[PDB]
Design an enzyme around this catalytic site. Structure first.
Site, short mmCIF file in Angstrom:
data_model
loop_
_atom_site.label_atom_id
_atom_site.label_comp_id
_atom_site.label_asym_id
_atom_site.label_seq_id
_atom_site.Cartn_x
_atom_site.Cartn_y
_atom_site.Cartn_z
N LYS A 15 -8.89 -1.68 27.37
CA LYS A 15 -9.14 -1.15 26.03
C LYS A 15 -7.91 -1.27 25.12
O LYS A 15 -8.04 -1.43 23.93
CB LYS A 15 -9.58 0.32 26.08
CG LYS A 15 -8.48 1.28 26.48
CD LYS A 15 -8.67 2.64 25.86
CE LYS A 15 -7.85 3.71 26.57
NZ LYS A 15 -6.39 3.40 26.56
N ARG A 85 -5.71 13.20 23.63
CA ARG A 85 -5.76 13.36 25.08
C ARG A 85 -6.48 14.66 25.41
O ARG A 85 -7.03 14.80 26.49
CB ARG A 85 -4.34 13.40 25.67
CG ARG A 85 -3.58 12.08 25.59
CD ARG A 85 -2.15 12.24 26.12
NE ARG A 85 -1.27 13.01 25.23
CZ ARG A 85 -0.69 12.54 24.13
NH1 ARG A 85 -0.87 11.28 23.74
NH2 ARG A 85 0.11 13.32 23.41
N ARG A 124 -4.66 -7.17 40.51
CA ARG A 124 -3.43 -7.25 39.74
C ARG A 124 -2.29 -6.61 40.56
O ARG A 124 -1.16 -7.10 40.55
CB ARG A 124 -3.60 -6.52 38.41
CG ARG A 124 -2.34 -6.46 37.55
CD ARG A 124 -2.54 -5.59 36.32
NE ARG A 124 -2.79 -4.18 36.65
CZ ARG A 124 -1.84 -3.29 36.94
NH1 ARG A 124 -0.56 -3.65 36.94
NH2 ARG A 124 -2.17 -2.04 37.24
N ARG A 130 2.70 -4.46 43.73
CA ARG A 130 2.74 -3.00 43.68
C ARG A 130 2.30 -2.42 45.03
O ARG A 130 1.50 -3.03 45.74
CB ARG A 130 1.84 -2.48 42.56
CG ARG A 130 2.21 -3.01 41.16
CD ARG A 130 1.33 -2.44 40.05
NE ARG A 130 1.33 -0.99 40.04
CZ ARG A 130 2.11 -0.24 39.26
NH1 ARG A 130 2.96 -0.81 38.42
NH2 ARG A 130 2.05 1.08 39.36
N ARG A 141 -7.64 8.21 40.94
CA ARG A 141 -7.13 8.20 39.59
C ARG A 141 -8.29 8.01 38.61
O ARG A 141 -8.26 8.56 37.50
CB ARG A 141 -6.08 7.10 39.42
CG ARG A 141 -4.77 7.40 40.16
CD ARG A 141 -3.83 6.18 40.19
NE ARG A 141 -2.54 6.47 40.82
CZ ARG A 141 -1.63 5.55 41.11
NH1 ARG A 141 -1.87 4.28 40.83
NH2 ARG A 141 -0.48 5.89 41.68
#
Length: 184
Positions: A15, A85, A124, A130, A141
């Site tokens: 986004k 938020r 990714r 990572r 998450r």
């Protein structure tokens, strides 16, 4: 008069990149509360020196200061990506848009099947080397994101301004859907 667009979406939905593209193409200023403040502190501005102590004490910058910075930054055309938020911020922002004569064109909610978001993120991650992204951590998450964002989705849907968009497809396809949803 002015026009505003707000983007909401989970990590992996891209986004931010779409907000950046709509910004660049139609002349909207993409705001970042974090960047503006860091800039102020960096340059040692009078505002930066006032907020420095809040930051050093580990406190969060108060909503009234964040909304003040947004007012100082509103322009004829603005995009929010990463804000609001919280519901308190959503309410305060609506008051600010109303007071400045800024019409909210829509709140874009980019939707992607969870299996695809997980695949994307894990891919990714593998590529970038990572070590913090494994299936479990990513799905957790995503659940947290859903829990924190649901109140905002309800807030905007009740006002008829939520624009749910299909985020599967190429960037160009998703971009076309966002423009169609917004009507710009």
């Amino acid at each position: 008069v002015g026009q505003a667009v707000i983007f909401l979406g989970p990590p992996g939905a891209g986004k931010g990149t779409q907000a950046s593209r709509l910004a660049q193409e139609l002349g909207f200023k993409k705001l970042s509360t974090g960047d503006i403040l860091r800039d102020h502190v960096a340059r040692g501005t009078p505002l930066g020196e006032r907020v420095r102590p809040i930051m050093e004490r580990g406190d969060l910058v108060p909503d009234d200061l964040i909304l003040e910075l947004i007012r100082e930054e509103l322009a004829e055309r603005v995009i929010f990506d990463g804000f609001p938020r919280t519901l308190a911020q959503a309410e305060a922002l609506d008051r600010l848009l109303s007071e400045t004569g800024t019409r909210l064109l829509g709140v874009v909610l980019v939707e992607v099947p969870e299996e695809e978001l997980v695949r994307r993120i894990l891919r990714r991650a593998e590529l970038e080397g990572r070590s913090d992204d494994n299936e479990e951590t990513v799905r957790r998450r995503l659940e947290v994101y859903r829990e924190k964002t649901e109140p905002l989705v309800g807030y905007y849907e009740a006002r008829g301004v939520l624009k749910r968009v299909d985020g599967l497809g190429t960037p160009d396809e998703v971009y076309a859907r966002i423009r169609a949803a917004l009507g710009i």
